[PDB]
Amino acid sequence: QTLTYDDIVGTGLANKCPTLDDTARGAYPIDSSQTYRIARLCLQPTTFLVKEEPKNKRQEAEFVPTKLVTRETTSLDQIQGELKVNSDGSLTFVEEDGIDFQPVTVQMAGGERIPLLFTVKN
Amino acid sequence: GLPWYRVHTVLINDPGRLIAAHLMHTALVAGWAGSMALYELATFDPSDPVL
Numbered sequence: 001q002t003l004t005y006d007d008i009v010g011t012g013l014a015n016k017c018p019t020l021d022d023t024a025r026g027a028y029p030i031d032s033s034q035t036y037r038i039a040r041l042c043l044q045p046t047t048f049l050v051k052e053e054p055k056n057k058r059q060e061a062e063f064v065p066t067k068l069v070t071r072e073t074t075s076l077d078q079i080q081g082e083l084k085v086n087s088d089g090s091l092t093f094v095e096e097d098g099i100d101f102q103p104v105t106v107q108m109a110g111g112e113r114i115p116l117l118f119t120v121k122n
Numbered sequence: 123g124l125p126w127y128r129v130h131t132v133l134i135n136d137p138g139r140l141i142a143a144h145l146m147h148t149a150l151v152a153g154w155a156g157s158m159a160l161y162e163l164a165t166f167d168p169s170d171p172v173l
């Protein structure tokens with residue numbers, strides 16, 4: 001519904017992107033003469049995977065799961081940009097601004113902390 | 123006086139203190155086990171079980 005800050009504060013929901021009903025499987029018509037924008041783009045990570053260092057003999061590295069240690073501080077939101085219609089009919093989103101980066105520290109087995117600038121800048 | 127090599131014979135007819143001595147020996151062995159593992163965990167590299 002229309003929640004308020006006071007409904008959300010402290011619950012962890014401020015780090016969650018909005019969602020759509022399971023029945024929203026429709027279609028947004030794109031009018032090439034028109035010009036479009038993304039008014040809000042929200043990205044909520046749910047898993048962080050880090051490529052392990054395959055030792056000298058190697059064979060192949062895997063992406064291993066990690067533990068988040070920096071709490072519900074990870075999402076990107078309020079991102080905006082124009083949605084252009086290219087002449088070949090594709091759409092291209094060009095980010096202008098937004099909260100488009102979060103520092104994140106995850107932890108690997110054994111205890112190695114891995115910080116990263118989770119971002120979609122530009 | 124007892125010679126040094128016989129001090130522990132004072133337990134031969136003292137079941138209680140014999141048990142106390144055994145308890146202390148068992149304490150020391152379980153402690154060793156715990157200390158040895160912690161040392162090994164502090165020094166073990168788990169990242170290559172092949173080589």
Ligand code: CLA
Binds near residue numbers: 129133143146147
């Ligand atoms: C399982 C071990 C153990 C147990 C349960 C006992 C039990 C007993 N001892 Mg025996 N004893 C032991 C080991 C042990 N002893 C060893 C190793 C020695 C040679 C030092 C002796 C020498 C000894 C004597 C000379 C006497 C006893 C006596 C006795 C009785 C009374 C307690 C006493 O005075 O202790 C005293 C003994 C100790 C406090 C031993 C301490 C040894 C320390 C903890 C070693 C630590 C070294 C170092 C800190 C290690 C760390 C690392 C290092 C690199 C820094 C009791 C039956 C007495 C008794 O009844 O005689 C009739 C007595 O007069 N004991």
Ligand code: CLA
Binds near residue numbers: 126128129130131
């Ligand atoms: C569970 C096994 C066990 C037990 C309970 C005993 C118990 C006893 N022994 Mg026997 N003994 C054993 C094994 C055992 N012994 C073995 C394997 C040997 C062959 C080496 C002997 C040879 C032996 C002799 C020749 C004599 C005894 C005597 C005695 C009595 C007095 C010991 C004393 O006060 O020492 C006091 C000891 C000290 C004050 C210091 C000893 C420090 C030694 C040299 C090195 C320490 C090593 C380290 C701390 C711990 C052990 C490491 C590893 C084994 C776990 C006591 C009833 C004596 C006896 O009959 O008197 C009536 C005696 O004369 N023992």
Ligand code: CLA
Binds near residue numbers: 137140141144
């Ligand atoms: C009631 C039956 C019964 C049971 C279950 C035991 C059990 C045991 N006796 Mg024996 N004992 C019995 C009757 C019994 N005894 C009788 C009738 C006598 C004549 C007095 C003896 C005299 C005797 C002597 C002289 C010695 C034993 C020892 C031991 C222990 C050797 C193993 C050990 O320490 O493991 C390692 C220990 C653990 C893994 C932890 C044990 C935790 C248990 C569950 C006990 C919890 C607390 C409990 C209420 C205390 C009472 C214990 C029980 C023996 C009464 C073991 C627990 C030896 C001993 O005490 O070793 C130090 C020893 O020296 N017993």
Ligand code: CLA
Binds near residue numbers: 130147150151
């Ligand atoms: C099945 C395994 C087992 C057995 C049978 C024993 C038996 C014994 N241990 Mg125990 N112990 C064990 C495992 C075992 N232990 C383990 C795994 C640890 C942890 C590392 C210990 C730690 C421990 C300590 C800390 C002490 C004992 C002691 C004793 C003795 C107590 C009775 C006594 O007065 O002996 C009389 C002593 C003898 C008969 C001497 C026998 C000598 C043996 C064979 C060792 C040989 C000399 C040794 C290698 C020299 C060390 C040199 C080094 C410092 C450079 C007895 C011989 C106590 C002891 O020796 O008291 C004096 C003692 O203080 N033990």
Ligand code: CLA
Binds near residue numbers: 151152154155159
């Ligand atoms: C609550 C009980 C308990 C449990 C679940 C464990 C569990 C463990 N211990 Mg600890 N431990 C305990 C009590 C316990 N311990 C106590 C009381 C002591 C002090 C004495 C220790 C001292 C100790 C040491 C010193 C070490 C461990 C180790 C270990 C690990 C390997 C065990 C192993 O290989 O045993 C193997 C046991 C045997 C092979 C025993 C064989 C028994 C012989 C054959 C006796 C036969 C005589 C019998 C009376 C005849 C039977 C008649 C038959 C007809 C039925 C495991 C995590 C090891 C480890 O990794 O530590 C970090 C190690 O090195 N433990």
Ligand SMILES: CCCCCCCCCCCCCCCC(=O)OC[C@H](COP(=O)(O)OC[C@@H](O)CO)OC(=O)CCCCCCCCCCCCCCC
Binds near residue numbers: 124125126127
């Ligand atoms: C946790 C670790 C703790 C470890 C504790 C330390 C270990 C305990 C100390 C053990 C040292 C033993 C000292 C006993 C020494 C000593 O007390 O001896 C003299 C002693 C005499 O005993 P008696 O029966 O006369 O009793 C006299 C009493 O006052 C002794 O308490 O005899 C014994 O000890 C028998 C064993 C003889 C040992 C003979 C050794 C002589 C070798 C000399 C030759 C050397 C080489 C030279 C030629 C190259």
